[PDB]
Amino acid sequence: AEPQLQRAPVAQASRISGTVPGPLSSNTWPLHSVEFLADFKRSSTSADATTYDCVPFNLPRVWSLARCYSMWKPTRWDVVYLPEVSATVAGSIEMCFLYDYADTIPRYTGKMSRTAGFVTSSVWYGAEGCHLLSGGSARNAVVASMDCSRVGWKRVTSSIPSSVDPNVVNTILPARLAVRSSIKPTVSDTPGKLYVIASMVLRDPVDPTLNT
């Protein structure tokens, strides 16, 4: 055919609309995952509960994805206790959630029981929780569920301002998981494992390297 006589424009707009396509470019992105939280450490001297900040950057794998978004909203967050001790082991594991950073960490059973999301279990009970981490059946699992309803959209951070008014911390920290041992062993030990079954929604992308 005839060679086409192209008309050359002074320019030609180069335009892109919206976050460049890829795995985490959608306005929002829902994510469900099982994440090892920590060892159930049993102090032999302290009766104080151990605290765990329920925020994305504390979940290595989830964090990898979460740092690509600026906002997140927890939908599930459930911590399962997996026993790794015989049925001869005395003691109990106590768990509850603290929804205000300003609130004091429970130092004993009574305090723990009076706190939201409270749960206790024979340190050797709950192995069936292993099946929770995969399929389901929380029938015989030791789980501490965090109240996620009513939790709004939180900014995704890579840190927690700890030496700051608890009120500013609250703006980023939906809740803290408080884990306590009902008794003091003669020597520190680790009766089981704590795995988190988190479900959240990420929103509004951001270059990971900028996210803090």
Q: Which residues are annotated as a binding site for Ca(2+)?
A: 100, 103, 156, 211-212
Instruction: Give the residue with the Cβ less far from a second copy, 2 or 150.
Output: 150
What is the SS3 assignment for 168?
Answer: helix
| Residue 4 near a second copy by CB under 8 A | no
Give the CA distances from residue 109 to residues 7, 42, 47, in Å, rounded to whole numbers and listed in that order: 82, 14, 10
Residues numbered 171-190 forming contacts with a second copy, rule: CB under 8 A: 171-172, 182-184, 186-187, 189-190
Q: How many residues of this chain bind Ca ion (CB under 5 A)? A: 5
Residues numbered 110-149 forming contacts with a second copy, rule: CB under 8 A: 110-128, 130-131, 133-135, 137-145, 147, 149
Give the CA distances from residue 156 to residues 71, 102, 114, 189, 202, in Å, rounded to whole numbers and listed in that order: 5, 21, 30, 34, 9
Instruction: Give the residue with the Cβ less far from a second copy, 2 or 10.
Output: 10
Contact (Cβ atoms closer than 8 angstroms) between residue 177 and residue 146? yes
| Residue 162 near a second copy by CB under 8 A | no
Residues numbered 45-84 forming contacts with a second copy, rule: CB under 8 A: 60-65, 67-68, 70-71, 82-84
41 membership: H or E segment, kind and range:
strand 28-42
